[PDB]
Design a protein around this ligand. Structure first.
Ligand SMILES: *[C@@H]1O[C@H](CO)[C@@H](O[C@@H]2O[C@H](CO)[C@@H](O)[C@H](O)[C@H]2NC(C)=O)[C@H](O)[C@H]1NC(C)=O
Ligand SMILES: *[C@@H]1O[C@H](CO)[C@@H](O)[C@H](O)[C@H]1NC(C)=O
Ligand SMILES: *[C@@H]1O[C@H](CO)[C@@H](O)[C@H](O)[C@H]1NC(C)=O
Ligand SMILES: *[C@@H]1O[C@H](CO)[C@@H](O)[C@H](O)[C@H]1NC(C)=O
Ligand SMILES: N[C@@H](CCC(=O)O)C(=O)O
Ligand SMILES: N[C@@H](CCC(=O)O)C(=O)O
Lengths: 280, 414, 403, 130, 79
């Protein structure tokens, strides 16, 4: 068909990862259980027991600190019976933090990313002169995968005049450096080139997605007599499984670009953005 | 779909408000084996009938749809007298003369191509296996899972063992209350902020050094082990392509079928090496691809081998199932016609022009690629209130314990 | 030629009575009559030899015995018939031996085989030292020397504008998180000094929990028992729980044991089973504990299994390896065309291709387990020496105070 | 896991709120005291005795603790994520590997002259490319 | 993975008279366990984390903080 290649250096980060574990419900009921214990503490356990004053403000603050590790100095309530009650709440906090990290490790071991574009129908290709430094793409002229674009997207074919590489080999060299950011070529050579690159540094949009699917052929002379004999031969190879042998012998690569297992990441300013918005 | 009263199709609209296009199908009713067949009008629509209308305008002809007689696809079988073999079903009616254009999903292979003429494929497919998706399951109801119950009792016992020994060791050294020292050990384990008593003698100070480090090892290991039950919990029971060993040598605990008189039977007999498992299929082949899918949902069938363009639409809407394997026989569809027909050239050019314009990439959008259920993106286990109950009841059910402690503490006073 | 039925190598199935003839891709097996198909790995070899050499054959299942055994003068089974000129070859799963090869000459082995042990897979286990095993000795060698240096700086600088023991309780306690009340200085420089050591503590706590989790998620399975040289197999009556093991009689794996460990052989007699498939239910039901049989069958039967709960000792350790073979007539003169034909297949990859067709399966793994006391019992010994260390300090101070 | 750009803002974000807390509590019915209060939370050290007497600082202190907790928990996950997902694949997986049947002119592989690998390779016609 | 399995073997001339006893004294060494001694004495006897490395960055600032602290002490004393 027609396919798209990308650098994969950017990919997509995962923002708002802090709220990925737990749920919106557990936090809401966490506050009400944060205060029911404190309200009974001042009014029942401390006031109805012997041995200046333990105000309600200290009770909510003291019971809060243990949730996110005790680091602020505070004054504990008196009374022998009031000691055990706080210890019961403390054991809630120890497990509460322990499970949160354990669940957080599950999400970042099997993280899934999203490609930076959706296809040729995305606005980044249709109308590029509206953004940050413009998107780059280009294709080798004098073929089909450029005749097809010259009929349907004649608006954006003008923008591709300056970017015109001179073959697949030269363009894949300049795609990593940064001269251009996208490559548009028939989806049977890009898949092989993607699957035969060291380090899996280049991935194809959609992981095997074609955009105007037309096969190959053997362009016999018109009005020939061989056409009915050749066709039966090719339709025969599929039945015997011979073609499945040739595809394994020649069209096989080493990089398994289908898998999206990202080998960790270094979180940057943009990645942890939701946390700072809570601070604001 | 059955027709409405007065013989007309029911009015309808799509999600975007476009009125769907429908034709009139005159086909058999209640085509059960051993039953008479009665012809009644129906209503037909979908992918191909959306394509058929497009051709019928460009080339300017006029159509008259009618469903197949029996309901099969097409194969060659021997007659009783000698072997004057003939075709059957939807493939045979084109040669007889009762139909002139087989607008339907019809794979192209060498057996059929020797009698009729196909067109350029309007969809590229393969063969893949559909198997039942087992329950992902989940093991999180009580927090006593990372450690065995034999250790929490021992660990709690060890707290009282160390705590009591601070008073004996420090007092005998040439002071702090034992009850005060009781909250020292408890404070370390629970990371609480209560307790003020601390050892003073260096004999007791060195004792408290290691116990502080013991609390870190136990809790860190516990929170480390809880990661194991979130990345290791996954079974592995699935078929890997056709070459999976479970498929070569059948066992009575595994059964797998296809649709009778289709292209797959021609595929499984032309080959000769795979002639030991197909013989187990001949006693289980189903009657319709819309029935063998229902049988799998009832656990009466383990595997199903069919076209990859249908099994990946049912696997989305009926998300109880998931498709496994790698495509192993790729051949596109085709609008077959009788050999040496006048229209045989302009049809093959009004299909090659529907690929480039973005048309057949637009029918694909509105019929085959609308999403209803997500897929199995590994085993994501988010935490909800239902999972954690033991912790929530202990804090909720432990507040009444403090009521008892007050009543006995005041009793000791008087 | 003669042939017996071993399930993964020669499979016997009744002929289809509808056509009154055998199926496609099989050869007739005229029992000694009847007539039925028979296919498998060993039979698939036979057709290839008859192709590049050229001869006529007629298989027939042997009925006298099983695989060959001596009754003090006579032989029965596949070896028994060939030795007595009632046949020519004897293809199948016939293990090369010494007592056999003195009377009938074999061919080049084409499958490797020995004696191995099959036991039931159990729950996964981690090393007891996991509390400190994933850490290098260099980590704690330099860890404490930093603490001693810092505690000397704070006390010495406290004079310029706090006892030695107070520095130990304060600076150290930050590494294991703040959970014990401590005394702190109030000097404009001393406060900054504590902050530096605190930061390393968070990293140490962060690093510790990650490595212990990562090391434990993926690891290697812990073996249960070593080979036949173990004292349990050699001397079973010297342990309070008597181990239960046995083997199928009348074969090579019985005569090999009888001539090497006669002390063990007299004990295994009561623990016998008359088949292979029958004896693998006993392992599932816990009646037995181990099985002793020729490796090429146990390796296959450990893969064609439901649940994959059976593994072999040593992950495929083979003892006294002797391959399979094709018997002959001690003078056959057919031997050289057969020796030079088998070796040609290994030159190609035709024999390797067959092993994928028949001798293959699934689940050629790790299991999550609760820690329990035993696995973490190692870290408890750290606690025990600490309690003993207090007594040593208590006695030393008490004596020096007196005089 | 965190680049130097992050640590550029960490050293100022904690410091900037310190003066703000001193501003809010003082003018309601010092700088050194608030500096130890905020920083100690991040490192989990019980330093200083300064407490938020004003209610405004307490509620701000409450949310401030949550900011520190996420940093510690998240960072631990990142470090544990690297060890498991770290494998610079360079294995050849034996024969039939595409890197071996089709040489790159830089992946040079050899054997010993004469021997029995040469006899094995020459006989098979399909092995004439390598 | 192993891809050409063929055992070793003693060579002999095509007409040597010892072939009937060399080929047996090897078939008897396998069963006595003899070649499981040679496999132990000569072949299977030799078997060759965070550590100090990967953490020298924080090691230096501990002394670096000491060095930075000492210089400020003179300012404290002078003030
Ligand atoms: C191989 O071993 C056999 C016996 O296992 C040998 O046969 C005997 O050899 C001795 C040697 O002088 C003779 O005295 C005997 O008469 C032989 N026969 C028997 C029954 O003992 C044979 O010689 C050995 N082969 C070689 C080449 O030495
Ligand atoms: C493409 O066609 C143009 C126009 O004829 C020609 O100048 C050019 O050499 C061709 N090839 C390339 C790679 O541009
Ligand atoms: C096919 O299209 C060509 C183009 O005009 C026309 O001349 C011809 O008559 C058409 N034939 C059929 C059978 O539609
Ligand atoms: C082994 O051979 C003996 C010889 O008589 C026979 O009695 C016994 O039943 C055989 N064991 C079997 C068939 O399991
Ligand atoms: N497959 C294309 C390659 C050339 C191109 O896409 O520009 C063709 O031969 O027409
Ligand atoms: N198959 C081997 C071993 C049989 C057994 O151990 O029972 C043989 O016939 O000699």
């Amino acid at each position: 068909g027609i396919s798209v290649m990308v650098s994969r250096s950017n990919g997509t980060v995962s923002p708002s990862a802090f709220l990925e574990p737990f749920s919106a419900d557990v936090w809401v009921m966490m506050f009400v259980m944060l205060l029911i214990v404190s309200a009974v503490a001042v009014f029942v356990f401390e006031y109805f027991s012997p041995v200046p004053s333990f105000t309600i403000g200290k009770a909510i603050w003291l019971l809060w600190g243990l949730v996110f590790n005790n680091s602020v100095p505070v004054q504990n309530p008196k009374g022998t019976t009031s000691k055990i009650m706080v210890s019961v709440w403390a054991f809630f906090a120890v497990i509460f933090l322990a499970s949160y990290t354990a669940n957080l490790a599950a999400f970042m071991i099997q993280e899934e990313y999203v490609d930076q574009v959706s296809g040729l129908s995305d606005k980044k290709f249709q109308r590029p002169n509206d953004f940050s430094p413009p998107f780059r793409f280009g294709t080798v002229p004098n073929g089909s995968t450029e005749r097809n674009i010259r009929n349907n997207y004649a608006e954006m074919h003008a923008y591709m005049g300056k970017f015109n590489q001179r073959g697949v080999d030269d363009a894949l060299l300049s795609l990593k450096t940064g001269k251009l950011d996208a490559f548009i070529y028939d989806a049977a050579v890009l898949n092989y080139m993607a699957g035969r690159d060291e380090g899996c540094k280049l991935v194809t949009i959609g992981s095997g997605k074609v955009f105007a699917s037309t096969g190959y052929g053997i362009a016999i002379q018109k009005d020939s007599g061989w056409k009915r004999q050749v066709d039966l031969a090719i339709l025969q190879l599929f039945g015997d499984g011979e073609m499945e042998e040739l595809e394994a012998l020649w069209l096989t690569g080493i990089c398994h670009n289908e898998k999206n297992e990202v080998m960790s990441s270094q979180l940057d300013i943009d990645n942890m953005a939701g946390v700072f918005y809570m601070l604001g | 779909k059955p027709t409405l009263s007065d013989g007309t199709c029911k009015e309808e609209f799509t999600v975007n408000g476009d009125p769907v296009k429908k034709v009139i199908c005159t086909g058999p009713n209640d085509t059960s084996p051993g039953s008479p067949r009665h012809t009644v009008p129906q209503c037909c629509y979908g992918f191909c009938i959306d394509l058929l209308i497009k051709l019928a305008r460009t080339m300017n002809f006029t159509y008259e749809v009618h469903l197949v007689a029996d309901g099969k696809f097409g194969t060659q079988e021997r007659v009783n007298n000698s072997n004057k073999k003939e075709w059957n079903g939807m493939m045979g009616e084109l040669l007889s003369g009762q139909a002139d254009m087989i607008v339907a999903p019809l794979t192209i292979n060498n057996e059929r191509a020797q009698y009729i003429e196909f067109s350029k494929p309007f969809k590229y497919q393969g063969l893949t296996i559909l198997v039942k998706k087992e329950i992902p399951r989940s093991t999180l109801d009580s927090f006593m899972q990372p450690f065995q119950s034999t250790l929490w009792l021992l660990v709690g016992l060890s707290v009282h063992v160390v705590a009591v020994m601070l008073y004996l060791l420090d007092r005998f050294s040439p002071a702090l209350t034992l009850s005060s020292a009781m909250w020292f050990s408890w404070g370390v384990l629970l990371n609480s902020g209560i307790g003020e008593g601390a050892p003073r003698s260096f004999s007791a100070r060195i004792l408290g050094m290691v116990w502080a480090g013991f609390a870190m090892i136990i809790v860190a290991s516990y929170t480390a082990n809880l990661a194991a039950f979130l990345v290791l919990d996954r079974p592995e029971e699935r078929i890997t392509g056709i070459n999976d060993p479970r498929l070569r040598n059948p066992s009575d605990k595994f059964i797998y079928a296809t649709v009778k008189q289709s292209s797959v039977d021609i595929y499984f007999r032309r080959q000769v090496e795979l002639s030991t498992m197909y013989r187990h299929m001949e006693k289980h082949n189903y009657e319709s691809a819309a029935e063998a899918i229902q049988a799998v949902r009832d656990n009466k069938l383990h595997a199903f081998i069919w076209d990859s363009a249908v099994l990946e639409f049912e696997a989305s809407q009926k998300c109880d199932l998931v498709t496994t394997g790698e495509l192993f026989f790729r051949s596109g569809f085709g609008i077959g016609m009788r050999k040496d027909s006048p229209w045989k050239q302009n049809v093959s050019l009004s299909i090659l022009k529907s690929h480039e314009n973005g048309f057949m990439e637009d029918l694909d959008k509105t019929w085959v690629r609308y999403q209803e259920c997500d897929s199995r993106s590994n085993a994501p286990a988010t935490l909800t209130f239902e999972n954690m109950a033991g912790v929530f009841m202990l804090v909720a059910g432990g507040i009444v314990a403090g009521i008892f402690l007050i009543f006995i503490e005041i009793a000791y006073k008087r | 030629v003669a042939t017996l039925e071993e399930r993964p190598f020669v499979i016997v199935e009744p002929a289809d009575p509808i056509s009154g003839t055998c199926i496609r891709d099989s050869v007739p097996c005229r029992s000694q009559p009847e007539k039925r198909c028979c296919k498998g790995f060993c039979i698939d070899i036979l057709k290839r030899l008859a192709h590049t050499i050229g001869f006529s054959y007629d298989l027939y299942l042997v009925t006298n015995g099983k695989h060959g055994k001596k009754i003090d003068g006579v032989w029965n089974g596949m070896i028994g018939e060939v030795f007595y000129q009632r046949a020519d070859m004897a293809i199948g799963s016939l293990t090369i031996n010494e007592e056999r090869s003195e009377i009938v000459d074999f061919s080049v082995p084409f499958v490797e085989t020995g004696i191995s042990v099959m036991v039931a897979r159990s729950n996964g286990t981690v090393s007891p030292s996991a509390f400190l095993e994933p850490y290098s000795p260099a980590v704690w060698v330099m860890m404490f020397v930093m603490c001693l240096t810092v505690v000397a700086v704070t006390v010495f600088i406290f004079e310029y504008l706090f006892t030695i023991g107070k520095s130990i309780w304060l600076l150290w306690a930050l590494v294991f998180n703040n959970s014990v009340p401590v005394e702190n200085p109030r000097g404009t420089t001393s406060k900054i000094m504590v902050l530096v050591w605190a930061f390393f503590a968070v990293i140490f706590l962060a690093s510790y929990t990650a490595n212990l989790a990562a090391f434990m998620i993926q690891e290697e399975y812990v073996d249960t028992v070593s080979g036949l040289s173990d004292r349990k197999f050699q001397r079973p009556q010297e342990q309070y729980p008597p181990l239960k093991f046995g083997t199928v009689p009348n074969g090579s794996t019985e005569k090999n044991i009888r001539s090497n460990y006669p002390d063990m052989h007299s004990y295994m007699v009561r623990y016998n089973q008359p088949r292979v498939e029958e004896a693998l239910t006993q392992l599932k039901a816990g009646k037995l504990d181990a099985f002793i049989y020729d490796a090429a069958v146990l390796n296959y039967m450990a893969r064609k299994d439901e649940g994959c709960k059976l593994v072999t000792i040593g992950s495929g350790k083979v003892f006294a390896t002797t391959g399979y073979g094709i018997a002959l007539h001690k003078g056959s003169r057919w031997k050289r065309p057969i020796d030079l034909a088998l070796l040609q297949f290994l030159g190609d990859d035709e024999i390797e291709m067959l092993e994928r067709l028949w001798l293959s399966g699934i689940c050629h793994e790790v299991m999550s387990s609760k820690l329990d006391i035993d696995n973490m019992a190692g870290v408890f010994y750290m606690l025990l020496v600490a309690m003993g260390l207090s007594l040593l300090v208590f006695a030393w101070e008490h004596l020096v105070y007196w005089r």
